[PDB]
Amino acid sequence: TTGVITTTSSQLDRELIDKYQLKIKVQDMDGQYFGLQTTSTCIINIDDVNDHLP
Amino acid sequence: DTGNLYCTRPVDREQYESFEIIAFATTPDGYTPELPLPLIIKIEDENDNYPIFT
Numbered sequence: 001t002t003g004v005i006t007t008t009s010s011q012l013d014r015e016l017i018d019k020y021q022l023k024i025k026v027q028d029m030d031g032q033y034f035g036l037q038t039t040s041t042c043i044i045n046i047d048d049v050n051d052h053l054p
Numbered sequence: 055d056t057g058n059l060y061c062t063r064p065v066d067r068e069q070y071e072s073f074e075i076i077a078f079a080t081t082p083d084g085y086t087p088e089l090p091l092p093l094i095i096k097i098e099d100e101n102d103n104y105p106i107f108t
Contacts, residue, residue, distance in 0.1 A: 037082060 005042070012046055020044040059093075067099035 003026070022042050029035030059077075078090040 033083060 014046045014048045015052065018046050020046070065097055067097050068103055070097050072096045 003024075005022070005024075020043065022044060023039070024042060025037050025039045027035045027037040073095045075093045075095060076090050077093055078086065079088060080086055
């Protein structure tokens with residue numbers, strides 16, 4: 001209903017992967033069959049937290 | 055919308071040789087009513103990497 005995006009997993013590490021892609025659509029007619037539809041992408045940048053010690 | 059198939063950036067015969075890619079079709083309502091097409095795609099070679107003294 002709102003197009004707020006969330007995570008579902010804690011399986012993230014910037015020391016390995018620093019970007020994602022995710023593919024998304026909006027559609028009218030409350031998503032029914034003749035609801036017209038338009039598609040986009042978004043990218044998710046991962047920022048760093050201090051989890052490696054020196 | 056037309057199935058024209060392109061590459062986004064330059065490759066190197068130095069680095070790569072060949073690539074296998076699947077093409078497929080999908081409906082807007084989220085289903086796959088027919089078989090996929092495997093593609094075969096080769097990188098071609100020129101002398102373009104210089105000689106270099108050891």
